[PDB]
């Protein structure tokens, strides 16, 4: 069996443990008081779906980012290569391909990077904004006070 | 070979038990907003508080069980082979058994070439950015803080004792200056420090103190 199917294999059997370790009784237990054992449980299976869900995206992605499965299946190959071996200019390409693929993910890496820091710079504009329109009407705010202390002096 | 064993696995693992145990986190806080959501926070604080904290030093436990678990089989069995076979793995040639043509070694130099010159570019408005971003934020907090002391001033009491009719003139003519200096501030680029606004509060911070001298 691959590798990379070894690998995800046992990542799924990490993540579905690690639920079964923490399972409702566990959780309530915890809270010895409560008698709405359906709000307990909802909870509870709101916190592992959350968890479960989030976690196989995010293993998905970083498989991804990291371009394991490749990885993974050229050590096989260099295994089976070995075996085939046992029973009976190129350097130079590799690397160019490695820093090819490397740019490449940099390329895509800095419009992201790029993307958000141009949305970060708007979020700014408009919190200063917003800071500047309030500005301007405790500004009038304070103009009716110091009118309205001019005003008690007539008294 | 020995990058992909020894280097290649790391910053995997590092990352699935990082984003494992942030995520942890991010649950047991669902979990206490949650709480809120029921009759029972009101009556049951401490309860609550210490119950799930002590579910969160359990589900901490598990996780780092089972992801060591996982970190050593993947570095020990998935990024591991046969020692044995350490002499009859190849001198490095998955990639030499093909030939590669001068053409085409040429044209991978073109194309490394030009990712590069993409690259460059694109740098260059990361750089432009990071600095527009960093003015920005400058700019955001300083305002902020004078917001801060203008709601301070409108939170002032009259502590009342017979008022001068030269500190509220001076008062009402600051005033009017800021709102023409806050207005400068909106329409125009950012600096790092919006003087005049700074100083008009700074003015109308001392007729309130003169005001409530004591």
Same mark, same amino acid.
């Given at each position: 069996?691959?590798?990379?199917?070894?690998?995800?294999? *046992?990542?799924?059997?990490?993540?579905?443990?690690?639920?079964?370790?923490?399972?409702?009784?566990?959780?309530?237990? @915890?809270?010895?008081?409560?008698?709405?054992?359906? +709000?307990?449980? +909802?909870?509870?299976?709101?916190?592992?779906? *959350? *968890?479960?869900?989030? @976690?196989?995206?995010?293993?998905?992605?970083?498989?991804?980012?990291?371009?394991?499965?490749?990885?993974?299946?050229?050590?096989?190959?260099?295994?089976?290569?070995? /075996? *085939?071996?046992?029973?009976?200019?190129?350097?130079?390409?590799?690397?160019?391909?490695?820093?090819?693929?490397?740019?490449?993910?940099?390329?895509?890496?800095?419009?992201? /990077?790029?993307?958000?820091?141009? %949305?970060?710079?708007?979020?700014?504009?408009?919190?200063?904004?917003? @800071?500047?329109?309030?500005?301007?009407?405790?500004?009038?705010?304070? /103009?009716? %006070? +110091?009118?309205?202390?001019?005003?008690?002096?007539?008294? | 070979?020995? #990058?992909?064993?020894?280097?290649?696995?790391?910053?995997?693992?590092?990352?699935?038990?990082?984003? &494992?145990?942030?995520?942890?986190?991010?649950?047991?806080?669902?979990?206490?907003?949650? $709480?809120?959501?029921?009759? $029972?926070?009101?009556?049951?604080?401490?309860?609550? #508080?210490?119950?799930?904290?002590?579910?969160?030093?359990? $589900?901490?436990?598990?996780?780092?069980?089972?992801?060591?678990?996982?970190?050593?089989?993947?570095?020990?069995?998935?990024? =591991?082979?046969?020692?044995?076979?350490?002499?009859?793995?190849?001198? $490095?040639?998955?990639?030499?058994?093909?030939?590669? &043509?001068?053409?085409?070694?040429?044209?991978?130099?073109?194309?490394?070439?030009?990712?590069?010159?993409?690259?460059?570019?694109?740098?260059?408005? !990361?750089?432009?950015?990071?600095?527009?971003?960093?003015?920005?934020?400058?700019?955001?907090?300083?305002?902020?803080?004078?917001?801060?002391?203008? =709601?301070?001033?409108?939170?002032?009491?009259?502590?009342?004792?017979? &008022?001068?009719?030269?500190?509220?003139?001076?008062?009402?003519?600051?005033?009017?200056?800021?709102?023409?200096?806050?207005?400068?501030?909106?329409?125009?680029?950012?600096?790092?420090? =919006?003087?005049?606004?700074?100083?008009?509060?700074?003015?109308? #911070?001392?007729?309130?103190? !003169?005001? =409530?001298?004591?």
């Amino acid at each position: 069996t691959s590798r990379k199917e070894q690998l995800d294999a *046992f990542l799924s059997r990490t993540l579905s443990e690690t639920i079964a370790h923490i399972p409702l009784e566990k959780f309530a237990q @915890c809270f010895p008081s409560m008698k709405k054992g359906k +709000v307990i449980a +909802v909870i509870h299976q709101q916190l592992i779906e *959350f *968890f479960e869900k989030s @976690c196989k995206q995010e293993y998905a992605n970083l498989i991804k980012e990291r371009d394991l499965n490749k990885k993974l299946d050229m050590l096989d190959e260099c295994i089976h290569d070995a /075996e *085939f071996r046992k029973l009976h200019k190129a350097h130079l390409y590799s690397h160019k391909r490695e820093l090819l693929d490397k740019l490449n993910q940099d390329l895509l890496d800095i419009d992201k /990077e790029n993307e958000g820091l141009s %949305t970060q710079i708007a979020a700014e504009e408009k919190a200063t904004e917003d @800071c500047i329109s309030r500005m301007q009407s405790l500004i009038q705010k304070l /103009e009716k %006070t +110091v009118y309205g202390m001019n005003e008690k002096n007539l008294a | 070979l020995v #990058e992909l064993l020894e280097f290649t696995p790391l910053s995997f693992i590092d990352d699935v038990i990082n984003i &494992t145990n942030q995520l942890l986190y991010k649950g047991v806080n669902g979990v206490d907003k949650a $709480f809120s959501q029921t009759r $029972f926070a009101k009556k049951a604080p401490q309860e609550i #508080e210490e119950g799930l904290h002590k579910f969160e030093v359990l $589900f901490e436990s598990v996780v780092d069980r089972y992801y060591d678990g996982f970190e050593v089989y993947t570095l020990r069995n998935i990024f =591991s082979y046969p020692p044995e076979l350490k002499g009859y793995m190849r001198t $490095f040639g998955k990639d030499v058994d093909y030939s590669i &043509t001068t053409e085409q070694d040429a044209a991978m130099d073109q194309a490394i070439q030009e990712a590069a010159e993409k690259l460059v570019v694109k740098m260059q408005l !990361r750089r432009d950015l990071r600095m527009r971003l960093s003015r920005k934020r400058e700019k955001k907090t300083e305002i902020e803080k004078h917001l801060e002391r203008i =709601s301070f001033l409108n939170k002032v009491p009259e502590n009342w004792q017979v &008022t001068l009719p030269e500190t509220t003139d001076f008062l009402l003519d600051q005033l009017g200056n800021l709102q023409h200096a806050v207005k400068r501030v909106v329409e125009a680029s950012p600096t790092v420090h =919006s003087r005049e606004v700074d100083e008009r509060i700074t003015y109308l #911070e001392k007729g309130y103190e !003169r005001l =409530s001298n004591p």
